[PDB]
């Protein structure tokens, strides 16, 4: 966390600084996007946050 990394989450290859989110998904969502239809949040698949 707080570090620039090459991430893969569930097949989502990308790069970015990961941070603990204040967002709150409904249980069936796993992923999140901004107005531009671009990723801006992801849910950890092992320790659900």
């Amino acid at each position: 966390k707080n570090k620039c990394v090459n991430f893969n989450f569930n097949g989502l290859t990308g790069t970015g600084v990961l941070t603990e989110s204040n967002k709150k998904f409904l249980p069936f969502q796993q992923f999140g996007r901004d107005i531009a239809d671009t990723t801006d949040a992801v849910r950890d698949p092992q320790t659900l946050e």
């Binding site: 970015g16 901004d34 531009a36 671009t38």
Partner: peptide, 26 residues
């Protein structure tokens, strides 16, 4: 007047004169 792009290589540059300097000239 009321005023996700960044990581696509796009960026917005500040004006040379700040809104305080435009107000001082005015």
């Amino acid at each position: 007047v009321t005023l996700a792009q960044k990581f696509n290589g796009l960026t917005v540059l500040p004006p040379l004169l700040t809104d305080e300097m435009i107000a001082q000239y005015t």
